[PDB]
Design a protein around this ligand. Structure first.
Ligand code: NAD
Ligand code: K
Ligand code: MG
Ligand code: MG
Ligand code: MG
Ligand code: MG
Ligand code: MG
Ligand code: MG
Ligand code: MG
Ligand code: MG
Lengths: 45, 161, 86, 46, 108, 155
RNA sequence: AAACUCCAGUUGACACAAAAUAGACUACGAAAGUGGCUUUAACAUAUCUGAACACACAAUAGCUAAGACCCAAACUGGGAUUAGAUACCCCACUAUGCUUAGCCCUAAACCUCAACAGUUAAAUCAACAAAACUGCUCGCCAGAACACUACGAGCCACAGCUUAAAACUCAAA
């Protein structure tokens, strides 16, 4: 059960990381992400 | 480059009449028939003659830097073959740090000798980083994205103006 | 195995005294440390226990020799009282 | 002094020219490295 | 540096021993060595039975070769001594005369 | 029933738990097992140096593996003999050496089991799949179920 | 009792295992560690201090790939045993102990004494331990338990490691 909780937490961490990254380029004025940018999954092997 | 194996030992290079001896004696008194430490001594002597103003003064900071650089080269040569020698890896890393400290002192005190040492030994002096912190995955990815976002912002501003 | 036989740990019998030869061989093996080695090799002694045992034995020997030296040094005074009464 | 000692010593070294003669001479020779010590510290050669 | 080769050769007749000694010294010279001397310690019973090249030996001829060689030669020479079928056992050591006889003042 | 605390925990251990072992699978593929409460050793008149757990077993209407008991026992024992290793290292010990490498691969492919799964990370459905495939292999090989690798190592 | 009797004794051949005696020595290495023989490389720094995180190492156990397997041996079987036997004894045999290339990063990892420099005069000095102190620097600590925990963060680690709280409670510990 701790595996399910832990993997859900890792998913939420990845979502938070993506949200912050999006916040940055949205505030900078870019409507979309940098050309060719793709957020890597750093919290999953 | 190493000294040629035919070169005489440091202790048998000024003996009078050393050039009037048999070829066998020359071989016996050459680097070919000795261990690596005599070759390192010859390297140190060559560097001292090429670099320092007074080659006899082994007490100066430049002489110490030359000696430690020769030792560092020896450790690197050892570790090229002995890749799992942790003790010698530690010795190499400590020696590099000590040479950096001596180079910093030399730069602060005598800039001309510092330049001469850096040129002669092929050393590229580098300034230390200001902050020591882990570059974990999140920070690396975030910094990459920030650099990129700055680049498209610059492109967009150039297009605007 | 590769050595010559009947040289190591070999004793000759004198005038048919087999018991004396056997006891001499036992003494030789004891003072050469072979008996204690054989008896200690029957079961494995852990390195920490081995080190503790050797340290204890060495310090026991040193302490015993010092005590014996002290007793022997103080033995000289143990004689008849020269000032009996006073 | 060391250089001169080596210079005089090399005259007796084994070379490709004198290999066979020296080999035979060694075969017809014996050298003994054994000696014993006494309780008094005196060397007793064989 | 200065090295000493302790050679235990098979108990052979004089011509074969001479040939083996010549071959060994020639290998030393081919590896860059300068041979100083060759001492024959004699033929004697081995301290123990030695098995070499699918042959058992109880006797052997003991020889000493003093020489000067580059440090890289030693390893190579060892390999050669492993292949010579007439060598029971060859060992290269640093020459004991090079080792310095440090003097002491006695028991403290 | 009362057990020692560790035995009760192992009987009622979930996947991934430090106490997941043979007893966990064997009890939980047939019963609903609940470790209700633990009694400390001080409460027993001659006080033991261990705690005591109370475990309730309720037999399941539908057992989670429809295979003979001894087959499941052998499979679970061979899976858990190397508890910290990959599961395939234990599974290969079910087959003779000659067909060890090939049979383990066939078993893992037919059962659809990730070889890198450790014994403590195997659910009862993974054991169901492995037991079914092992039953098929035993039916197709009459001498397989009686193989003991230790006896083969005796020779 | 089981087991073996392709068993046992002498003799000969014969390791990828482990290194009597020396060692009653107290050495080398930053620590961990290091005690069969030979050889080659080789043991940083001529101020000192200087990091949970930077850079390099860390016994034993444990995990990936390959290999070796004498002996030992968690587990797994069998023999023998009270009256719920011996967990313990006997036999057989695994992981593992070994080598190669990578992980993991923990110890009563302890001299339970932080590094450098200095003193032996003072009242020596709570106690015990290991005589009592001084200068200077870094690290750390401010009642117990909650807690070598939860959450957050980092990690080739995935119920693992490092950092590390709060609430409720008590007059103690
Ligand atoms: N944080 C730095 O990068 C940094 C840089 C220069 C000097 N220092 C000095 O190191 C001392 C420790 O500072 P802190 O308490 O804030 O660090 P800290 O211990 O609280 O750790 C926070 C960060 O500082 C780094 N750090 C820790 N000790 C350091 C050191 N001696 N040198 C360089 N980096 C270090 C760590 O890697 C970590 O990333 C201070 O005296 C500070 O002046 C720190
Ligand atoms: K201790
Ligand atoms: Mg420092
Ligand atoms: Mg800090
Ligand atoms: Mg480790
Ligand atoms: Mg291991
Ligand atoms: Mg094994
Ligand atoms: Mg410190
Ligand atoms: Mg508190
Ligand atoms: Mg924790």
């Amino acid at each position: 059960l701790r595996r399910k909780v832990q993997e859900g937490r890792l998913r939420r961490k990845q979502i938070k990381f993506e949200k912050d990254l999006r916040r940055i380029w949205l505030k900078a004025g870019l409507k979309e992400a940098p050309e060719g940018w793709q957020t890597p999954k750093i919290y999953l092997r | 480059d190493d000294p040629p194996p035919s070169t005489l030992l440091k202790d048998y290079q000024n003996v009078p009449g050393i050039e009037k001896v048999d070829d066998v004696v020359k071989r016996l008194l050459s680097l070919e028939m000795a261990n690596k430490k005599e070759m390192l001594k010859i390297k140190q002597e060559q560097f001292m003659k090429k670099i320092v103003a007074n080659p006899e003064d082994t007490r100066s900071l430049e002489a110490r830097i030359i000696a430690l650089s020769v030792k560092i080269r020896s450790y690197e040569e050892h570790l090229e073959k002995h890749r799992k020698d942790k003790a010698h890896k530690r010795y190499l890393l400590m020696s590099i740090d000590q040479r950096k400290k001596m180079l910093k002192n030399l730069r602060n005190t005598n800039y001309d000798v510092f330049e001469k040492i850096c040129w002669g030994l092929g050393i590229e002096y580098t300034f230390p980083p200001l902050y020591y912190r882990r570059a974990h995955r999140r920070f690396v990815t975030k910094k990459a994205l920030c650099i990129r976002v700055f680049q498209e912002t610059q492109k967009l501003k150039k297009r605007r103006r | 195995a590769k050595h010559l036989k009947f040289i190591a740990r070999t004793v000759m019998v004198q005038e048919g005294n087999v018991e004396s030869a056997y006891r001499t061989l036992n003494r030789i093996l004891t003072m050469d440390g072979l008996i204690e080695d054989i008896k200690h090799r029957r079961y494995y002694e852990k390195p920490c226990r081995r080190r503790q045992r050797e340290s204890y034995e060495r310090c026991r020997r040193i302490y015993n020799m010092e005590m014996a030296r002290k007793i022997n040094f103080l033995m000289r005074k143990n004689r008849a009282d020269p000032w009996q009464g006073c | 002094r060391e250089v001169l000692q080596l210079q005089e010593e090399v005259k007796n070294f084994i070379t490709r020219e004198n290999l066979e003669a020296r080999v035979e001479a060694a075969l017809d020779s014996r050298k003994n490295y054994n000696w014993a010590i006494t309780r008094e510290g005196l060397v007793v050669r064989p | 540096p200065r090295y000493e080769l302790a050679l235990i050769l098979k108990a052979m007749q004089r011509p074969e021993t001479a040939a083996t000694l010549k071959r060994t010294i020639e290998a030393l010279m081919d590896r860059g060595a300068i041979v100083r001397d060759l001492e024959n310690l004699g033929e004697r019973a081995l301290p123990y039975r030695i098995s070499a090249h699918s042959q058992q030996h109880n006797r052997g001829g003991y020889f000493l070769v003093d020489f000067y060689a580059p440090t890289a030669a030693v390893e190579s020479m060892v390999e050669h001594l492993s292949r010579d079928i007439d060598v029971i056992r060859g060992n290269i050591v640093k020459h004991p005369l090079t080792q310095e006889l440090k003097e002491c003042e006695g028991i403290v | 029933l009362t057990f020692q605390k560790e035995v009760a925990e192992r009987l009622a251990a979930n996947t991934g738990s430090k106490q997941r072992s043979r007893l966990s699978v064997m009890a939980q593929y047939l019963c609903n097992v609940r470790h209700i409460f633990t009694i400390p050793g001080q409460a027993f008149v001659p006080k033991p140096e261990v705690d005591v757990g109370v475990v309730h077993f309720t037999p399941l209407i539908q057992p989670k593996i429809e295979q003979p008991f001894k087959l499941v026992e052998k499979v679970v024992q061979n899976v858990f003999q190397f508890r910290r290793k990959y599961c395939h290292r234990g599974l290969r010990m079910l087959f003779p050496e000659a067909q060890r490498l090939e049979s383990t691969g066939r078993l893992l492919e037919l059962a659809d089991i990730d070889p890198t799964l450790r014994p403590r990370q195997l659910s009862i459905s993974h054991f169901k799949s492995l037991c079914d495939v092992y039953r098929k292999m035993c039916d197709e090989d009459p001498q397989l179920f009686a193989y003991n690798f230790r006896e083969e190592l005796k020779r």
